[PDB]
Amino acid sequence: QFYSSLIEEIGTLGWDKLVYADTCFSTIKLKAEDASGREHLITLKLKAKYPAESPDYFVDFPVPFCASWTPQSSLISIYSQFLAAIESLKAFWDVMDEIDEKTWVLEPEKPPRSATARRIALGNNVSINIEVDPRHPTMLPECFFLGADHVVKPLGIKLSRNIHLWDPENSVLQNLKDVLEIDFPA
Amino acid sequence: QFYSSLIEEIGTLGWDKLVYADTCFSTIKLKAEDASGREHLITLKLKAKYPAESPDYFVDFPVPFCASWTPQSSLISIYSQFLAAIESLKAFWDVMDEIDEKTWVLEPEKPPRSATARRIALGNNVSINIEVDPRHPTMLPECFFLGADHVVKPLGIKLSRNIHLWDPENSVLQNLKDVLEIDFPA
Amino acid sequence: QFYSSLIEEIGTLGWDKLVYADTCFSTIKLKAEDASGREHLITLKLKAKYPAESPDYFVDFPVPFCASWTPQSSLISIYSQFLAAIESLKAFWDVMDEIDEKTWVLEPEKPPRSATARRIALGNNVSINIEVDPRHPTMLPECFFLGADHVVKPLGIKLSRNIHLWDPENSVLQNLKDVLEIDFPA
Amino acid sequence: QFYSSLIEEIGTLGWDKLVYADTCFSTIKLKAEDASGREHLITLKLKAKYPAESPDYFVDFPVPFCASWTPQSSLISIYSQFLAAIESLKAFWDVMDEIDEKTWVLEPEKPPRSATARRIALGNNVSINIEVDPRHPTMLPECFFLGADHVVKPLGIKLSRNIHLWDPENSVLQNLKDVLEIDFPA
Ligand code: PRO
Ligand code: PRO
Ligand code: PRO
Ligand code: PRO
Ligand code: NA
Ligand code: NA
Ligand code: NA
Ligand code: NA
């Protein structure tokens, strides 16, 4: 045939998935859109000995990603180990999406899909830092209050007193509104 | 040269534009997203004599599309004509998008981008047919009512009475509301 | 890499060796001329997974041919094994060529290079069948006569009487003449 | 398709005809075997604008060769204008082949197919130079005798006296033997 095993593999996935390739096709990017409408990219760098030797691949995830064990590799199987990981993280990105859409995020600026922390502005010179566990994203995040004692001490008290209200069936944002008894600036 | 230049041209275009190719790359589909967020596809069927022989191509437009092509042409050159045609039709698809989003369209069921006619229900017992000129999409379209006389007579009188109020700076739907003095079922 | 390396390998081999290829270059035929002026062809059927997956191949040999192949192999590497096998069989084809040129062969009609048997007419009323071992083509072959007893009895007696005179430094035809003390119809 | 119009043309002629190509396929050689068993090669150099612009091509003929007029070119049509020319010259190469096989040619050394002259040794310090007309190769060639008057003067006399014996239905060599009443050294 005129084309390499790589090209046959891409044709099988669908050319619509390939969103970048260098001239030698030694670097490619594949896209996947998740069930929630988010686009995710995986970059693969192919060596001379593909598919005997596994490609290097880079993703934007808040957890490690690792692919196959199989004797020879397979862009096909990898892309499917990428889709499964993406669906496994749906709850985490749902939580983060809502926070990013509805609140005033101080840090990070332009958060990648890998970012598990948000520093959210609550008011004049007060913010809350939350660290979300991407595998249990609707539980109580680690919270840290940044500001003067006159504002954050009472928040700490409400947090301890109202913690029983935390409902994992609700979003992180909703639970924060309920447990801290506050409104978030937009 | 042994290989065609097709692959080099796709690279220049950007692999993100290629959304389908058969195994021999004798048929490909390229996508363009217009300034208004709509996706449009062009299918090209190639022969080995490419580019000496123009590819066959198929688009979904409400007007004819015939590319200028010579042996100096490439995917990029037909793709650019395709984009220009798409932008020239922005006003037409803007008018149709609104009608399809806001009214009860009986025909076509799932209108292609080429469809210039709509049958719109004005109730369970009366409809209006419009035929829109894609080159002049906000002028008065050719229309007619279907339904019993007692239902259409009143519409017909309001139409001939308010026909002068038609404002090409307004959408087809808005003008119809103003002329017929009605509300469209959703 | 986008393209296979098949075309580069054919170039290394020399395009003069390629005597057939289908439109997709999934089937090719390579020719070798042996040291004795005989032409031999090998047909290879390739898949996109080449060279990770060994090609299928077909030759016209009187013994099995199984190439050593790994992902480091190329057309050149199987072609070289093919040439080595061809030269190893020079003595066999030298013996068969002489028989086919100088005697009246009844079977096969147009013998392929794989054919190790010949039925040779000793007249209009008697034949001898030989089966030649391609690995030991000048040893005494397995043979038998066909024909009426009065015609074969004399041949059979001369054979058992002169069987010791067989000289492996001589061709099969020459030895048969010396043992049977006869002349072969042309 | 993955391949250029050139590759499709070569596939149509048969890969067995292509006996050389450079890496970029900007230079190729095609072979033709004539009805008389002689091999002839045509070299073609392809430009960027093939097949709009005619390739350059080189042959080894004793007459000019020139190909098409057609609006666009065609390796196919050219190869067939090459085969026809080759068959047209069969008589000329038949005459030259016999001379080269049976006589002692002093010049040229290793004659190409284009060479219309032969200087043939007749004996100690005597030769004959013949110039054959490739379009009328069995007629009396232009003859010139190289040697001392005592040998060449009588040959000149025999040539004039016996010229009526020249028989265009016979080869140049045969006619020379008959008209000059001599034997040619081997
Ligand atoms: O009038 C037109 O142009 C459209 C094209 C498809 C059918 N009607
Ligand atoms: O607006 C309506 O009533 C129609 C009924 C079918 C779907 N929409
Ligand atoms: O004995 C052999 O090996 C040959 C092969 C083809 C049939 N007989
Ligand atoms: O030698 C012979 O007589 C056989 C007859 C058919 C062809 N050769
Ligand atoms: Na793509
Ligand atoms: Na709780
Ligand atoms: Na060839
Ligand atoms: Na004469």
Swiss-Prot record, chains A, B, C, D:
Protein modification: The RING-type zinc finger domain is monoubiquitinated in the presence of UBE2T and UBE2W.
Domain of life the protein comes from: Eukaryota
Mutagenesis or variant effect for L41A: No effect on interaction with FANCI and FANCD2
Compartment(s): Cytoplasm; Nucleus
Associated disease: Fanconi anemia complementation group L: A disorder affecting all bone marrow elements and resulting in anemia, leukopenia and thrombopenia. It is associated with cardiac, renal and limb malformations, dermal pigmentary changes, and a predisposition to the development of malignancies. At the cellular level it is associated with hypersensitivity to DNA-damaging agents, chromosomal instability (increased chromosome breakage) and defective DNA repair.
Functional summary from the UniProt entry: Ubiquitin ligase protein that mediates monoubiquitination of FANCD2 in the presence of UBE2T, a key step in the DNA damage pathway. Also mediates monoubiquitination of FANCI. May stimulate the ubiquitin release from UBE2W. May be required for proper primordial germ cell proliferation in the embryonic stage, whereas it is probably not needed for spermatogonial proliferation after birth.
Descriptive protein name: E3 ubiquitin-protein ligase FANCL
